[PDB]
Amino acid sequence: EMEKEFEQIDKSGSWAAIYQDIRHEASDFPSRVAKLPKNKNRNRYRDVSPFDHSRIKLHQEDNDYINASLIKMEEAQRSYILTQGPLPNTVGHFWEMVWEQKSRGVVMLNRVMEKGSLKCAQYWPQKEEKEMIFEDTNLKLTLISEDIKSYYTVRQLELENLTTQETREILHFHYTTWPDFGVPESPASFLNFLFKVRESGSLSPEHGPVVVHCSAGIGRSGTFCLADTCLLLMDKRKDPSSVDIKKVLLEMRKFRMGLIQTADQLRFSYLAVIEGAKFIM
Numbered sequence: 084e085m086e087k088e089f090e091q092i093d094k095s096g097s098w099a100a101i102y103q104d105i106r107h108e109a110s111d112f113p114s115r116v117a118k119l120p121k122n123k124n125r126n127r128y129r130d131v132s133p134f135d136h137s138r139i140k141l142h143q144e145d146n147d148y149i150n151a152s153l154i155k156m157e158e159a160q161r162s163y164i165l166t167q168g169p170l171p172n173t174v175g176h177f178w179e180m181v182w183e184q185k186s187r188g189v190v191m192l193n194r195v196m197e198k199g200s201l202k203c204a205q206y207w208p209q210k211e212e213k214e215m216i217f218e219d220t221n222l223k224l225t226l227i228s229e230d231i232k233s234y235y236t237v238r239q240l241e242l243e244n245l246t247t248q249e250t251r252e253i254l255h256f257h258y259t260t261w262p263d264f265g266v267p268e269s270p271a272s273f274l275n276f277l278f279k280v281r282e283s284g285s286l287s288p289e290h291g292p293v294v295v296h297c298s299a300g301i302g303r304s305g306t307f308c309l310a311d312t313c314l315l316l317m318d319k320r321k322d323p324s325s326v327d328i329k330k331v332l333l334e335m336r337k338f339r340m341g342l343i344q345t346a347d348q349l350r351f352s353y354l355a356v357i358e359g360a361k362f363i364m
């Protein structure tokens with residue numbers, strides 16, 4: 084059981100050690116499309132690339148590339164799109180992806196400014212009456228409503244395909260209180276946020292995959308989909324002993340590199356799953 088494995092790693096201080104074995108066992112697949120010179124300004128970080136095999140393709144004939152990966156968890160019957168925080172020049176591609184993949188939710192785990200630098204473009208409207216038009220992808224985005232809570236904000240957005248005049252409602256789940264350094268001291272507010280995403284239906288098989296991002300789309304974003312998948316598997320098996328968080332993480336790392344960036348995020352992922360287990364057992 085992971086609770087006992089947790090105490091062992093914690094009492095032995097072996098987190099940096101466990102984390103390194105994960106790094107060494109992780110899949111390495113080609114990312115040729117990400118490294119083409121025409122895509123250099125579509126990537127926020129030169130060392131974070133989607134694998135070719137799992138990359139999301141845009142349906143535009145010109146350039147189909149976006150720094151996004153499809154993570155398909157077969158036994159949990161859950162899919163996720165993990166992406167980077169959009170750049171000034173990829174905000175239209177971001178919303179095009181949301182449209183094309185029939186996503187109902189966007190999960191954002193960063194602030195636009197962290198450690199005095201920009202981690203993401205402002206890619207949604209701040210006021211109802213000031214909608215955004217993405218001329219490159221022919222989309223319009225309107226803020227419908229905003230609910231600001233202590234640890235996160237939920238926004239109701241309307242996305243309109245200006246080409247066909249179809250509209251959809253997108254839910255934006257913005258976790259606003261992830262610390263500039265380390266990890267949230269308790270997983271309580273993170274679990275409350277995750278259940279709020281679940282309750283919305285954004286993670287349900289009747290919709291396209293949820294879009295999840297932070298700045299790179301590997302660290303905080305990894306913690307979110309690792310906790311969700313582990314808790315779902317514990318329900319499907321109704322046994323918190325058959326589920327190995329290290330095996331789940333390695334399976335997710337076949338789809339996008341680098342998921343879970345620090346030994347701290349790994350320890351936090353354990354704590355989140357152990358605590359969430361109480362509310363599902």
Ligand SMILES: CC[C@H](O)[C@@H]1N(C(=O)OC)[C@H]2CC[C@]1(O)CC2
Nearest residue numbers: 228229230237238239254282283
């Ligand atoms: C709980 C679902 C989600 O939060 C949505 N919303 C919202 O912005 O948060 C309260 C309103 C209540 C139901 C909505 O689906 C639509 C309007």
